């Protein structure tokens, strides 16, 4: 044992338990609890009683649910089920109808609040000259308003960013208060029986005009043809001579389409509004603007609300060509003669982000949906024009639905869309169970806000009725498992491919990754913390003292927990032998040894919440600020502490002085997952880090735990079939179920975690554990200060939500609740887990529960059917945080045995859910039971052999503009998103289309279509084609998303003039990019506690730190990890430079893999693809940098550190080590046997420390060697030829 080990052990022994303070501050913890728990063995009789009761309950529930009482035929049972489903649906609909002040059935509100106009080009520029000389007619208030506007323009009274500053007749629509009242009059809920016929008409209809690309429509975003041509020339110089390839050709064709023109128009509207809102220059005036080179005019007003912007659109009659569609879906307009005008429209500041990215998102969505149904991605628009099959209609329908939901961008619509997943997954339930889709009826939104929601609800109701009437039919022959009767949840048309169906289910995920707040309507978050707290038992007798007979919320059985612990210990003894305890001890010691201050010292966030912020009145003006972990961790390390454990004890003492958690909350405004964030203090962070480290250490030993063994997640299902065939020794039958927990986060008490953790650890860790858990028994959560500011001055009748009423009454002292206090600024809670702050421990608890239920399932099969079947059946677990899955496989030779097996498997599936209660594992309605050859886990679906994923989840994510910083940073993160989507199961051609979308978005970001000056910029950037100036690099279409930004840069430098610039740096100014690019683009004071110091001791960069100052150096290096003017400045770079392979080697250490890919993907010309036949098995494959001959015996870093410092971690022969060193030396010319000579000779230490890259490993899912992957994964409709 090293010095670190012995000193850590000595310190840990120095930590001691203080029972008095813990008992006093934290009620439910006591010496007697743990003493009795460790001493008393579990009550076998009680366990047997509860197991028998669960068996009886499961049998009764199965009999009653499936209507086996009379032994009726399938027909009558299904009729009864349909009757029940209809009754439930009618109940929900009537409950909706019971509301008052319902919106009238005919009061149509357009889902899209924009005109359907489509027009030609006009005079360029942003000037308002075209307004002059227009004779507008009409009498509508907007007609008169725009008449005044044109009169002022003719009189040239418009100021300058043009400001109208109109006078009389400016009121009666703008009284500074009218409009904000008007759009406030849209609070009436929508009836379920509202007329929504026009939505259905628009969605599914003979809509072919949408895809006719002619007439020279307005298209401001088609001015970058030369740039795309140059980009294509990089990879396909021969083809580029002829012209654009297929992908760019169809991209520009889609630009030229009617929908393309409209999408570009709306995107320009979004960008213009986003620019306008930043001005805030009008005293009390209006601001008028004109779109670039078009007859579109926007009359804009921001109000005193500072959260809504009011717009009025106008178009010249002479320029207006026609309308995209005459349906009510779009905002109706008013004729005024020379002009067509619409009414004022209010927009929230959040939607503008969606508006700007409309065109790219829609190109992506349409391409993906066309690809999913079999239409080639690179040739779809024409196919959409000649709609001749159900596939084309379905694709168009889904694209239009994406349009509607994106333009509506309301969360409730997204949840309604996502519910379809669980609605339709019910159709795979095999006998003896029957599908119960109607059980999701309780998940509908409380209120209806839009016509689109009504239409979606009606579609969902029809789908539920249809599914409950008749499940999907199975078809088995010669190992060719298949299903029949599937249909789209929304359109209702038949389907035959799993992938489009799953994509339909997951359509509600359009992650845009907005890392900001969301003040409006966040009470639900707070509500989500309270709903269970009031249900806490008044007595703690069932929180770890005794065993409840009928468990309630938050209660659990001590004896069952101890029995599960004993069973898990027995399993571990069987697996790892008798000395498993000491192995665990060594593992945890090793894990804590490597738990340094540095690894926690990441940006993330921290809460400065102390007692100073308890009273709202004291702090009303000071703005709360979230500190970074960096400063606090650095301050702690400056004291001279190396390991994060070192500062545990003292830190907890501070917490013990506080006696409560000091958590703060954060709501992300992104429309998807991980909205909840529980930011938490430094001392809490260190303690929780220790606890989670030990939890993960203990849990790693269990194979079935996916969290601790991510490889096992993909390993287990694939090997399941092979193991089943080996064991059963013949044809097999598989049953399965996927389950999700109900109120997992706020349903758990904390004592059980401490108990079970102590059962698996030696006594010396006990004080570390019981203390570290007790701090969760009382937690105070801050709220948003603006929320309280609003609440204080809101008086009564705030909102109909009872939670807000209760909070208001408690804050003013009118009412008393245990989760709030008068005049305070926090919610106090005794239970909870704060959304994954205690993550590994929960997984361990789930793991042990599943091991016990596995044993019980073995017993049940042995009992109910035949004694000896345990020797010839397979059972498999999968668990994570809260999602779980159960797999069972048995021989399928005898029909009677097969039926008995199915009955027993259903019984065991119900057993798991029923018994989960005793450990406070509450099953959710989302769980699906007894589905044959169907399995779900983390949204990954396993339809027998096929393994499918919801690729759409990553589509919308690929289109975003976060992280700003440098342009090259933006491009490389775009490449990262491309890698993410392609590894998600998409085809390469679809990836190329997404890259085109990203290209157009990125180019319009610099102002393409916004400012005339962009035309000058194009003139310059073309000459130098440097990404540092914003030039976008299109990857080779055949292998886009695989080679990545490194491939793009390598190809660029290989032949283009760009290399001449890089050699200029080898012989405004900024440093190199992480990708290696010498870019140019266009806190530290607080960390007062270095390059020369690192140079003096490079070993710091090559080993884990053991002292303070080195930790400071490591965090320090972690911290430091105009356009016309700039092109004018570049005129001085006339230095004559040439090629140099050594510079390429320095920039790219992995040249061999890059050229290997190049040898296949370079200059492939046109595309010829042979269509495939039916479906094939999905096979995992290793693709890139798999070889080790060129990648050396071990990593270059290991060899360098062994040579310079003798770390002897290479574990190779001495002569082998010398040979490896010599071959590296001939690889690396400037590498020397000493750090000093190497530093002097090479053309600081950090820059040459990380140049050893060793890129990551990539795996792909082929559908039957890099050539194989590229030929079989370019497109899903076929495979390449000649490769």
Numbering used by the authors: 214 to 373, 412 to 1318, 1337 to 1351, 1364 to 1370, 1374 to 1405, 1451 to 1572, 1579 to 1599, 1608 to 1626
Provide the authors' own sentences about this structure as they appear in the paper:
pmcRift Valley fever virus (RVFV) is a mosquito-borne phlebovirus of the Hareavirales order (formerly Bunyavirales) that causes severe disease in humans and livestock. The replication and transcription of RVFV, like other viruses in the Hareavirales order, are mediated by the L protein, a 250 kDa RNA-dependent RNA polymerase (RdRp). The L protein contains three domains: endonuclease (ENDO), RdRp, and C-terminal domain (including the cap-binding domain), organized in a similar manner to the PA-PB1-PB2 heterotrimeric complex of influenza virus. The structural conservation of the L protein within the virus family makes it a promising antiviral target.
We determined the cryo-EM structure of the RVFV L protein in the apo form at 3.5 Å (L proteinapo), which resolves the RdRp while leaving several peripheral regions flexible. This apo structure aligns closely with the previously resolved RVFV L protein structure (RMSD ≈ 1.05 Å), with positional differences located in the vRNA-binding lobe (secondary binding site and template exit channel) and in segments linked to dynamic domains (ENDO and C-terminal). The most notable difference is an ∼20 residue register shift starting near residue 1451. Both the RVFV AlphaFold prediction and the SFTSV (strain AH12) L protein structure indicate a loop in this region, whereas the prior RVFV model omitted the loop and threaded the sequence into a neighboring helix, producing the ∼20-residue shift. The RVFV L proteinapo shares a similar overall organization with the influenza virus polymerase subunits (PA, PB1, PB2) − and other bunyavirus L proteins, ,, reflecting their common evolutionary origin. The catalytic RdRp domain (resembling the PB1 domain) contains the conserved thumb, finger, and palm subdomains seen in SFTSV , and La Crosse virus (LACV) , L proteins. In the RVFV L proteinapo, the finger subdomain adopts a more open, inactive conformation than the replicating state observed for SFTSV. The PA-like region also encompasses the vRBL subdomain, which provides viral RNA binding sites. , Notably, the 5′ RNA hook–binding cleft is closed in the L proteinapo (preopened in SFTSV , and LACV L proteins), whereas the 3′ RNA secondary binding site is disordered. The ENDO and C-terminal domains are highly flexible and unresolved compared to SFTSV and LACV L proteins. ,, Together, these features show that bunyaviral L proteins depend on RNA-induced conformational flexibility and structural rearrangements. The RVFV L proteinapo structure provided a framework to map resistance mutations selected by EIDD-1931 and 2′-FdC.
